[PDB]
Short mmCIF file of C-alpha atoms in Angstrom, two decimals:
data_model
loop_
_atom_site.label_atom_id
_atom_site.label_comp_id
_atom_site.label_asym_id
_atom_site.label_seq_id
_atom_site.Cartn_x
_atom_site.Cartn_y
_atom_site.Cartn_z
CA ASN A 2 110.94 69.10 122.00
CA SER A 3 114.06 70.30 120.02
CA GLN A 4 111.75 71.92 117.32
CA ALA A 5 110.01 74.09 120.01
CA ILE A 6 113.49 75.22 121.30
CA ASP A 7 114.48 76.16 117.67
CA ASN A 8 111.18 78.07 117.23
CA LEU A 9 111.97 80.04 120.48
CA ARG A 10 115.54 80.96 119.21
CA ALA A 11 114.16 81.99 115.76
CA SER A 12 111.30 84.05 117.37
CA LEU A 13 113.68 85.83 119.90
CA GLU A 14 116.23 86.68 117.16
CA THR A 15 113.47 88.27 115.07
CA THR A 16 112.07 90.16 118.17
CA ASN A 17 115.70 91.45 118.84
CA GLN A 18 115.62 92.76 115.19
CA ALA A 19 112.18 94.45 115.74
CA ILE A 20 113.65 96.24 118.85
CA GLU A 21 116.71 97.50 116.91
CA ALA A 22 114.21 98.98 114.36
CA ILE A 23 112.20 100.80 117.16
CA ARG A 24 115.56 102.02 118.61
CA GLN A 25 116.49 103.59 115.21
CA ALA A 26 113.02 105.20 114.90
CA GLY A 27 113.87 106.75 118.29
CA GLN A 28 117.21 108.24 116.99
CA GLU A 29 115.23 109.80 114.07
CA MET A 30 112.66 111.35 116.54
CA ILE A 31 115.52 113.02 118.60
CA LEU A 32 116.94 114.59 115.39
CA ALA A 33 113.41 115.73 114.34
CA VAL A 34 112.86 117.50 117.71
CA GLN A 35 116.44 118.97 117.70
CA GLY A 36 115.72 120.27 114.12
CA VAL A 37 112.51 121.91 115.48
CA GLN A 38 114.28 123.58 118.46
CA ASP A 39 117.12 124.80 116.10
CA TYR A 40 114.56 126.37 113.76
CA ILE A 41 112.73 128.24 116.57
CA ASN A 42 116.06 129.44 118.12
CA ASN A 43 118.09 130.22 114.89
CA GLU B 5 113.45 129.16 105.21
CA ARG B 6 110.34 126.88 106.01
CA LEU B 7 110.75 124.34 108.90
CA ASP B 8 111.13 120.77 107.44
CA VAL B 9 112.18 117.71 109.51
CA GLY B 10 110.03 115.57 107.13
CA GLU B 11 113.08 113.34 106.36
CA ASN B 12 113.44 112.30 110.06
CA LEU B 13 109.69 111.61 110.54
CA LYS B 14 109.49 109.58 107.25
CA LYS B 15 112.56 107.51 108.20
CA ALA B 16 111.13 107.06 111.77
CA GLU B 17 107.79 105.95 110.08
CA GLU B 18 109.78 103.44 107.90
CA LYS B 19 111.73 102.13 110.95
CA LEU B 20 108.38 101.53 112.90
CA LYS B 21 106.72 99.87 109.82
CA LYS B 22 109.74 97.52 109.56
CA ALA B 23 109.46 96.78 113.36
CA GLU B 24 105.74 95.91 112.77
CA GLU B 25 106.59 93.37 109.97
CA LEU B 26 109.40 91.77 112.14
CA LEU B 27 106.90 91.50 115.11
CA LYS B 28 104.28 89.64 112.96
CA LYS B 29 107.06 87.35 111.71
CA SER B 30 108.19 86.65 115.38
CA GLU B 31 104.58 85.85 116.46
CA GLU B 32 104.03 83.50 113.45
CA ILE B 33 107.33 81.54 114.28
CA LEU B 34 105.89 81.03 117.84
CA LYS B 35 102.40 80.05 116.36
CA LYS B 36 104.24 77.25 114.35
CA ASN C 2 111.68 70.46 130.39
CA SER C 3 108.35 71.21 128.58
CA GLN C 4 107.26 73.54 131.51
CA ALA C 5 110.53 75.53 130.88
CA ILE C 6 109.84 75.66 127.12
CA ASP C 7 106.21 76.79 127.69
CA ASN C 8 107.34 79.39 130.33
CA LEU C 9 109.76 80.89 127.67
CA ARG C 10 106.87 81.01 125.14
CA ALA C 11 104.54 82.83 127.60
CA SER C 12 107.30 85.29 128.49
CA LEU C 13 108.26 85.98 124.83
CA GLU C 14 104.58 86.44 123.79
CA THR C 15 104.26 89.01 126.63
CA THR C 16 107.54 90.79 125.52
CA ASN C 17 106.23 91.06 121.89
CA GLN C 18 103.08 92.77 123.30
CA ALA C 19 105.22 95.31 125.20
CA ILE C 20 107.24 96.08 122.00
CA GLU C 21 104.04 96.66 119.94
CA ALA C 22 102.81 99.23 122.60
CA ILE C 23 106.19 101.12 122.42
CA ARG C 24 106.00 100.96 118.56
CA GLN C 25 102.46 102.55 118.66
CA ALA C 26 103.67 105.20 121.13
CA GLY C 27 106.31 105.93 118.46
CA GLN C 28 103.57 106.53 115.86
CA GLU C 29 101.84 109.01 118.21
CA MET C 30 105.19 110.96 118.71
CA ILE C 31 105.52 111.31 114.85
CA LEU C 32 101.96 112.81 114.69
CA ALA C 33 102.78 115.08 117.64
CA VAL C 34 105.96 116.43 115.95
CA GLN C 35 104.29 116.78 112.46
CA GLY C 36 101.58 118.74 114.38
CA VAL C 37 104.19 121.20 115.75
CA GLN C 38 105.90 121.61 112.31
CA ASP C 39 102.44 122.42 110.84
CA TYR C 40 101.62 124.95 113.61
CA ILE C 41 104.89 126.79 112.85
CA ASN C 42 104.55 126.79 109.00
CA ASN C 43 100.86 127.88 109.27
CA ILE D 2 96.62 136.68 113.79
CA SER D 3 96.97 133.24 115.49
CA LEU D 4 93.39 131.81 115.91
CA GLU D 5 94.24 128.71 118.11
CA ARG D 6 96.94 127.74 120.73
CA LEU D 7 99.25 124.76 119.77
CA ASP D 8 97.74 121.45 121.05
CA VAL D 9 99.37 118.00 120.26
CA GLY D 10 98.15 116.78 123.69
CA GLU D 11 95.74 114.09 122.30
CA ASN D 12 98.82 112.53 120.56
CA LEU D 13 101.27 112.84 123.57
CA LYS D 14 98.55 111.41 125.88
CA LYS D 15 97.98 108.27 123.64
CA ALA D 16 101.79 107.79 123.73
CA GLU D 17 101.81 108.07 127.58
CA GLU D 18 98.99 105.41 127.73
CA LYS D 19 101.16 103.20 125.41
CA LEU D 20 104.41 103.50 127.40
CA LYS D 21 102.47 102.84 130.69
CA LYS D 22 100.93 99.66 129.02
CA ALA D 23 104.48 98.56 127.80
CA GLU D 24 105.76 98.97 131.42
CA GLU D 25 103.02 96.61 132.84
CA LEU D 26 103.63 94.03 130.02
CA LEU D 27 107.39 94.13 130.64
CA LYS D 28 106.84 93.56 134.42
CA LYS D 29 104.51 90.60 133.51
CA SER D 30 107.13 89.07 131.17
CA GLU D 31 109.74 89.42 133.94
CA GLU D 32 107.42 87.80 136.56
CA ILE D 33 106.69 84.92 134.09
CA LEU D 34 110.42 84.20 133.39
CA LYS D 35 111.30 84.12 137.13
CA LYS D 36 108.89 81.15 137.48
CA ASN E 2 118.74 70.79 124.93
CA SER E 3 118.49 72.16 128.56
CA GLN E 4 121.60 74.40 127.93
CA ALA E 5 119.80 76.06 124.96
CA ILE E 6 116.79 76.69 127.35
CA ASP E 7 119.22 78.35 129.89
CA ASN E 8 120.70 80.59 127.09
CA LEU E 9 117.21 81.56 125.79
CA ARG E 10 116.25 82.61 129.42
CA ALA E 11 119.46 84.70 129.90
CA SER E 12 118.93 86.25 126.42
CA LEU E 13 115.20 87.08 126.93
CA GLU E 14 116.09 88.67 130.38
CA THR E 15 118.72 90.93 128.69
CA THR E 16 116.20 91.73 125.87
CA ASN E 17 113.52 92.85 128.48
CA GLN E 18 116.16 95.29 129.86
CA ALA E 19 116.88 96.75 126.43
CA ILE E 20 113.16 97.39 125.82
CA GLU E 21 112.77 99.10 129.30
CA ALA E 22 115.62 101.49 128.29
CA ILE E 23 113.87 102.25 124.97
CA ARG E 24 110.58 102.84 126.85
CA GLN E 25 112.44 105.32 129.19
CA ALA E 26 113.74 107.01 126.00
CA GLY E 27 110.13 107.44 124.80
CA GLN E 28 109.18 109.07 128.16
CA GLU E 29 112.01 111.70 127.70
CA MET E 30 110.91 112.36 124.06
CA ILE E 31 107.34 113.08 125.34
CA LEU E 32 108.67 115.65 127.89
CA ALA E 33 110.82 117.29 125.14
CA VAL E 34 107.81 117.80 122.79
CA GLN E 35 105.68 119.17 125.70
CA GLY E 36 108.75 121.49 126.29
CA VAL E 37 108.41 122.77 122.67
CA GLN E 38 104.57 123.07 122.88
CA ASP E 39 104.74 125.19 126.08
CA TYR E 40 107.62 127.50 124.93
CA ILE E 41 105.46 128.33 121.79
CA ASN E 42 102.10 128.61 123.71
CA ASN E 43 103.66 130.07 126.94
CA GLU F 5 116.06 133.17 126.28
CA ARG F 6 116.64 129.98 124.08
CA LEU F 7 114.18 127.04 123.82
CA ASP F 8 116.26 124.18 125.33
CA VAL F 9 114.90 120.63 125.75
CA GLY F 10 118.61 119.56 125.45
CA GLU F 11 118.29 117.69 128.79
CA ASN F 12 115.28 115.47 127.74
CA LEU F 13 116.94 114.85 124.29
CA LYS F 14 120.33 114.06 125.89
CA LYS F 15 118.86 111.54 128.39
CA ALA F 16 116.87 109.89 125.51
CA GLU F 17 120.17 109.55 123.59
CA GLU F 18 121.82 107.87 126.64
CA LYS F 19 118.85 105.43 126.98
CA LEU F 20 118.98 104.42 123.28
CA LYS F 21 122.78 103.83 123.48
CA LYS F 22 122.25 101.72 126.65
CA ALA F 23 119.48 99.76 124.73
CA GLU F 24 121.91 99.18 121.79
CA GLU F 25 124.57 97.64 124.10
CA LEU F 26 121.99 95.46 125.93
CA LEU F 27 120.61 94.13 122.60
CA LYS F 28 124.26 93.39 121.58
CA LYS F 29 124.76 91.45 124.85
CA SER F 30 121.42 89.55 124.19
CA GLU F 31 122.28 88.61 120.54
CA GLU F 32 125.78 87.48 121.89
CA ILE F 33 124.21 85.15 124.57
CA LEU F 34 121.84 83.69 121.83
CA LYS F 35 124.93 83.00 119.57
CA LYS F 36 126.93 81.06 122.24
#
């Protein structure tokens, strides 16, 4: 079923995008925590 | 001099809200 | 092979569930860090 | 004075439940693919 | 297209590994915020 | 002495860079 194969490719590409979003959220959380530790210290 | 990392948390909240919309899209492609 | 296509679907549906749990963990870390910022300012 | 200690433990604990759940779903996805 | 099925499998396998790394990131972020809670309380 | 969670935050940074490269490798397989 060539149409099912194309749905799987389109689904997995979009899931790979959702993961890149969650990864960037994670970079923002590290900065937020670092900002908190810098405040307390400095 | 007041602690504010509000720009990081709001961008993180935007990144996770985007992930959520992309996940619903992925699931609907598989529904199809 | 339709078993191979269906096996990919089951695996990808399970992966999307794992990503949604990590995304919701992310939302709890934001609340946690806001909570610390508020303790400090109050 | 400070009335209460700092407690964001209810949040950090829901996050721990979430990561543990992700870990079990990832092992399930892996076991499905292998088949 | 049985080649497209083989590429989807190798792709989804690499995607599961990316998500496990992000999940391990989240575990370290949880420790870090506990680190900040204790230092303030303790 | 200093508050320092620099270890947890550094390891998290490593894991997110490792995730970025894996996702790159995955999108590259899906392209081929």
